[PDB]
Ligand binder design. Structure first.
Ligand SMILES: O=C(NCc1cccnc1)Nc1ccc(CN2C(=O)c3ccccc3C2=O)cc1
Ligand SMILES: O=C(NCc1cccnc1)Nc1ccc(CN2C(=O)c3ccccc3C2=O)cc1
Lengths: 470, 466
C-alpha cells in the first residue's frame, strides 16, 4: 500500500492549480440534504485512519515508485516529487494533517458536518484534498450502518406492535452478503457496519476487522447458526430431499438449524416433508434449538404468507399477549431472498395484516444489505470550504446554478447540539462565539497519529434506537 | 489473511451435511440466462494468486479459526480434523482443481465459465468451502461486461456520426475511486474497466494488473490534468476566470479538463470561455485541447446546452458524415450521472441534434464500478455432480417458483461449435468430443496456478467484432 498511489489521478496535478501563496486548504464531509434517510450513522473513519493514514506512510521507495508510474500514466512530469520529499524529510513520512470528527456511532441529521480535514503545515496545502479519495470511501460503512439501522427501526416497530417487546431484535436481520460484495475488504467493512445494529452475520470477515480496529468486551462481535445450502440438499438426489432434511436436523439436534426448503418445491417440503414425514423430528426439538425453515425463491411476501399458512395447518398455532399468531417454539422461518429495506417493510406489514407475529420470522440480506448501495443514497460529499491565501482566510464554496442541492458550506465549521436537541453546523467560523456549547467534532487524527479512538461497544451504544432506550 | 475465516459461516457446518461416503463434490460457475447476452470472463487469476495458491493452512490459522468459530457458533462445530488433514498430507496446499475458460473470453450467458472439485475424497467439503471467495469473481466479470457494452454503444454512435472509431479507447474514463466500497474494489473494478478502455483516474487498478497480469506497455492506463471544484472555488467566487486562466496556462501543452459548473456552467461557457479567455483556447494544440467539464443538471440537457453555447462562440465544421464538429482545440466531457442508460440517452440525443460523438468523452464513477450487483448477470455457483458410495450422480436445483434458478446437471465442458460459437455439454457428454476439445483449461491444481494470462492476452480476447 502506497498512499501516493491511493488518490484520483487528477489530484496529482492539483498542487499547480490552487491560488499561488495558499497556506491552508480546509475541507469537510457531509451527507447532503435533498425510503428517506433523514439521519445517518457515522462509522468507519477509525479503520481508514489506522489502516492507511497513521505513521510513516511515505518512504523514498514509495516516492520513486509513484514518480515512475505517473511519468508513464500522464506521459508527462506532473508528480509533486518535492512536496512528497518534504514530508519524508521534515515529518519522517508522517502526514501534516488534522482530522476533526463526530464520535463514531453518532446519529446525525442530513446536511451536517461529520468530519473536517486540514493541513498543519503551510507547504502541504495540497495534502488536504489529496486524501479526499480515501476519506470519501467512508460513505460505504456510513451507508451500510444507516440502511441497516433503518431496517432495524422497521423490525423494532413491528416486533413491538405484534409482541409487546424487542426480544430477539438484534438477530432478526442476518448478513448473507459475503459472496455478493465486490471484494474481501468490502466484505469486512460492510459486515462490521451491519454489526453496529445487529449481532447476526455469516460474513466472518467483519469479526476480524472489529477485533483489530475497534474492539469488544465480548469474545466475538457477531454470531451465527448451522445452516444448509442447496449443495447439501441436492447432493442427496431429487428423491432423497427427506433423507437430507432428516440427516441435517439429527446432526444439529441441540442447536438452532436453518434448512433451505425450496430446492425442488418449498410448499411440498413444508406440507409433506416437514409437515408429515419428519414432523416427529421437529415437535421434539427444544426452544433453544428450533428448526428455521428457509424459503429461497419466488415472490418474497407471497411465499412467506403461503409457508406460514401451511405450517399453521400442520403445527399448533398459539396466540401471544398482543393477540398475534405464534408458531410453536421449535419452529421458525427465515426469508433470505430478495430482502432489502423495501421488501422487508412489505413482508412485516403483510404478516401483521394476516395477524402473524414478527417473533415468527427472521430476515437474511446479501446484496441488498452490503452491495446495492451508492455514494448518492446519502449524498456523501467532500468539499473545500475554507482557504488561506496571502495570509487572508477566505470562505470557499460551490453553488451550481442547475443544482442547489450541490451547494456546499462556507468557511470554518463546527457541529452543535441545540438546547431543544436539534443539530446545527455553524458556518464561517461562527462557532467561535460559543453560543451552542461545545463543538461535537473531536481531533481523531493529527500529524500521523490517531489522537482519539472508540470501541465497538461505544459505537453500538451511540447508534442505539430511541425504541431500544424506550 | 486466513482462508479458514474467508467463507460464509454456514459453510463451516456443511461437512456434517453431505451424504455419508461422499468422495467428490463438483461445482461450476455460470452467468445464468434471465441486454447482457455475453459476458467477459475476467478476474479469477487475481483470486487464485492472492488467496488460494501455496500453503494457505497453518497450525495457527487452524487455531485462530477454532477459537473464533467456538465463540461464533457458541458450539464446537469447526472441522479441525479436516483442515489438519490438509496441513499434514499436503503442507496446507488445497487439494482442489479449477478448470476455466481463458480470461478475456466473451462467452454467451448460460455457459460453464469455470468448475471446482476436490482432488482428494477426504476434502469433498472443500469444493463449496471456497465458493464464497470464487463467487466474488462476479464483480470483475460484471464490471468488464458493462464496460464492454458501453464501448459497443460508443462504437456504434462514433461510427455513425464520424465514419471511424478514432480515440474510442479514451471515450469512457474511470472516475469511480471515491464511490467504491474499498481500496481492494477500486483496484479490482478499475482493472476490469481497463480490459476495454485506456483512461482511468483509479490509480489502484494499475498496480493490480502489474502484479497479477502484466503488460508489454509500462502502464495499462492513462490520464490528463484536470480541475476539481476546490481548485476553482479556492480562488474566490469573483475569481473563477482567474482560476480557469491559471489552470489552462499551467497545462498549455497537454489536454486539460476544467470543471465549469462551480457557479454557472452556461455563463462559464458563454462569457468566461467564449469571450474573456477565448484567446487562450483557439491557440491550443489538437493533441492538447481544452476539455470543458459540466458536472450538474440533467446530463443530456446540459451537454446539448453546453455544445449549443460553444457552437455560437467557436467555429463549427460539418464532418464527412454531415455531423457538427467543434474546433480541434475544444472538447467536452460529461462525468455526472453517467451509467450505461444515460450514456445511451446522451449519444442518441446528440446524434438527433446533429452533433458528432468526436466532440464528447464520458466520465463514469459509481455507475461504472459501484452500481452493480451479482444479479445483473445472474452469476451463480452450484453443485452439479457428486460421487457417493463410489457412484456418480447428476445433482441440480429446480425451484417450483423460479425456473431461472434451475442449474446444470453432471460433469460440464465448454466447446467451440463448427459455426465458431459456444456450447455447454452436460452429464459428462463432453467426453465424446463431438465438437472437439474442452475449452476449459486447468488454471489451478493442488495449491498451484497451472495456467496464466497477461493483460494484453485478455485485452485481445475481449476485443469488439467491429
Ligand atoms: O439461514 C442461514 N444461513 C443460510 C445462508 C447463509 C449465508 C448466505 N446465504 C444463505 N442462517 C441463519 C442465521 C441466523 C438466523 C437467525 N435466527 C433465527 O431466526 C432464530 C430463531 C430461533 C432461535 C435462534 C435464531 C437465530 O439465530 C437464521 C438463519
Ligand atoms: O475530467 C477528468 N477528470 C476529472 C475527474 C477525475 C476523477 C474523478 N472525478 C472527476 N479527466 C479527463 C480524463 C480523460 C478525458 C478524455 N480525453 C479527451 O476527451 C481528450 C481529447 C483529446 C486528447 C485527449 C483526450 C482525453 O484523454 C477527459 C477528462
Amino acid at each position: 500500500f502506497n498512499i501516493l498511489l491511493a488518490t484520483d489521478s487528477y489530484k496529482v496535478t492539483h498542487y499547480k492549480q490552487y491560488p499561488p501563496n495558499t497556506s491552508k486548504v480546509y475541507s469537510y464531509f457531509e451527507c447532503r440534504e435533498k425510503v428517506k434517510y433523514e439521519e445517518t450513522v457515522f462509522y468507519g473513519l477509525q479503520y481508514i485512519l489506522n489502516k492507511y493514514l497513521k505513521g510513516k506512510v511515505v518512504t523514498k521507495e514509495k516516492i520513486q515508485e509513484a514518480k515512475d508510474v505517473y511519468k508513464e500514466h500522464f506521459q508527462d512530469d506532473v508528480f509533486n516529487e518535492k512536496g512528497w520529499n518534504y514530508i519524508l524529510e521534515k515529518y519522517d513520512g508522517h502526514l501534516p494533517i488534522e482530522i476533526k470528527a463526530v464520535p463514531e456511532g453518532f446519529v446525525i441529521p442530513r446536511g451536517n458536518v461529520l468530519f473536517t480535514v486540514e493541513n498543519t503545515d503551510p507547504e502541504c496545502y495540497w495534502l488536504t484534498n489529496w486524501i479526499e479519495t480515501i476519506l470519501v470511501q467512508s460513505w460505504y460503512p456510513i451507508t451500510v450502518a444507516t440502511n441497516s439501522r433503518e431496517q432495524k427501526k422497521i423490525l423494532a416497530k413491528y416486533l413491538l406492535e405484534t409482541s409487546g417487546n424487542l426480544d430477539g431484535l438484534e438477530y432478526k436481520l442476518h448478513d448473507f452478503g459475503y459472496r455478493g460484495v465486490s471484494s474481501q475488504e468490502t466484505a469486512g467493512i460492510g459486515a462490521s457496519a451491519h454489526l453496529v445494529n445487529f449481532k447476526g452475520t455469516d460474513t466472518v470477515a467483519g469479526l476480524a476487522l472489529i477485533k483489530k480496529y475497534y474492539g469488544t468486551k465480548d469474545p466475538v462481535p457477531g454470531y451465527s447458526v448451522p445452516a444448509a445450502e442447496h449443495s447439501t440438499i441436492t447432493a442427496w438426489g431429487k428423491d432423497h430431499e427427506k433423507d437430507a432434511f432428516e440427516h441435517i436436523v439429527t446432526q444439529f439436534s441441540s442447536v438452532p438449524v436453518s434448512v433451505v426448503s425450496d430446492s425442488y418445491d418449498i410448499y411440498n417440503a413444508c406440507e409433506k416433508i416437514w409437515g408429515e414425514d419428519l414432523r416427529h423430528l421437529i415437535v421434539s426439538r427444544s426452544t433453544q434449538a428450533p428448526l428455521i425453515i428457509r424459503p429461497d425463491s419466488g415472490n418474497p411476501l407471497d411465499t412467506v404468507l403461503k409457508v406460514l399458512e401451511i405450517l399453521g395447518k400442520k403445527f399448533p398455532v398459539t396466540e401471544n399477549s398482543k393477540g398475534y399468531k405464534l408458531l410453536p417454539p421449535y419452529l421458525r422461518v427465515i426469508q433470505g431472498d430478495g430482502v432489502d429495506i423495501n421488501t422487508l417493510q412489505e413482508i412485516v406489514e403483510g404478516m401483521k395484516q394476516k395477524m402473524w407475529s414478527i417473533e415468527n420470522i427472521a430476515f437474511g440480506s446479501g446484496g441488498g444489505l452490503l452491495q446495492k448501495l451508492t455514494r448518492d443514497l446519502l449524498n456523501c460529499s467532500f468539499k473545500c470550504s475554507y482557504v488561506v491565501t496571502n495570509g487572508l482566510g477566505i470562505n470557499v464554496f460551490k453553488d451550481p446554478v442547475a443544482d442547489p442541492n450541490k451547494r456546499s458550506k462556507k468557511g470554518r465549521l463546527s457541529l452543535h447540539r441545540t438546547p431543544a436537541g436539534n443539530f446545527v453546523t455553524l458556518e464561517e467560523g461562527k462557532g467561535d462565539l460559543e453560543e451552542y456549547g461545545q463543538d461535537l467534532l473531536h481531533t481523531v487524527f493529527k500529524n500521523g497519529k490517531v489522537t482519539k479512538s472508540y470501541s465497538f461497544d461505544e459505537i453500538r451504544k451511540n447508534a442505539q434506537l430511541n425504541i431500544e432506550l424506550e
